[PDB]
């Protein structure tokens, strides 16, 4: 009964000041994006999410319109100032196929094998973290192939063989792919609306 009362109090707190208003404090415009991300996180927090497959976003758009800002504020909403629950990964560092060792460590018999992986360690520290793969398009696509296991089922086996469950994580992927096309189509639609 105490757990149900605490859950109802948390639900009333979220209904009083949801993620949409908390994002509208920081983010300006992007009402479609705030609505999409808020509806998805509302589906997650109210228990209406498939617990097997993690929630995965791709933020597309022009430069400096709140992709990384909305991802950061989404992480701050889910975990407050806890740095464990916001696994930032600047994917412009991952421009070559062999940069997956940062994710999954190194195999046995190689340098850096004892340290293991970086993302797998950070997700061991916080399985339900908001992992921000910032600028995902700037990485090699073969490096993004590692994210298949991590997006379909939330698993990422390190160099030492230790798999980590990451199903509750909220993966966010900022990218400027088709930024010119999205910007031109939005400007065209605004001209037609005017």
């Amino acid at each position: 009964k105490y757990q149900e009362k605490q859950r109802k109090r948390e639900a009333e707190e979220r209904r009083r000041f949801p993620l949409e208003q908390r994002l509208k404090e920081h983010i300006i415009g992007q009402e479609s994006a705030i609505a999409t991300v808020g509806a998805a996180i509302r589906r997650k927090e109210n228990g209406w999410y498939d617990e097997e497959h993690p929630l995965v976003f791709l933020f597309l758009g022009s430069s400096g319109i709140g992709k990384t800002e909305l991802a950061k504020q989404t992480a701050k909403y889910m975990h407050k100032d806890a740095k464990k629950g916001f696994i930032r990964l600047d994917m412009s560092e991952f421009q070559e196929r062999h940069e997956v060792a940062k994710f999954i460590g190194s195999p046995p018999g190689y340098v850096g094998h004892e340290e293991g992986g970086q993302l797998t360690k950070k997700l061991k520290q916080c399985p339900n973290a908001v992992v921000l793969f910032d600028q995902v398009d700037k990485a090699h696509p073969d490096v993004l192939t590692i994210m298949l296991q991590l997006f379909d089922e939330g698993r990422l086996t390190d160099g030492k063989g230790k798999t980590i469950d990451c199903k509750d994580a909220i993966f966010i992927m900022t990218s400027n792919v088709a930024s010119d096309e999205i910007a031109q189509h939005a400007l065209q639609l605004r001209q037609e609306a005017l």
Binding site: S62, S63, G64, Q135, N176, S179
Partner: protein
Amino acid sequence: EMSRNRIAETISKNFKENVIRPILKAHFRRDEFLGRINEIVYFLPFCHSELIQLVNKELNFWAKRAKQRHNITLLWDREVADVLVDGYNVHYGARSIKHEVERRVVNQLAAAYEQDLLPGGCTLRITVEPKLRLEIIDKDSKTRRLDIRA
């Protein structure tokens, strides 16, 4: 043109947005990289007064080296600056003035120093003959040209 017309009687934002912005976008291929830059600072070429100031800076540098290392008070007229400005290349910039000073002035100084035609404390006036020529001074009416052999 406007100055002489009035006597007879700054890079603009549009240039940055219409000319330089497409060139930067073409080279760097990413507006996200350019939008992170706070100040795209524009360095313009040198005006003629700035070329004279560059020649004076280079000649003062060699004068300070001559005074410190060897105690040779180097001197020069404004005509020396006007002569050495003619070796300025717009494409190369201030490096052209440094190379021109090293060609015309300092090769002669080095050849004079190797030949021991520049004792300590002596004054030395670079003078336009236009070929520059060194002139050692001892009194208020003695200026013999240094005969630098090959």
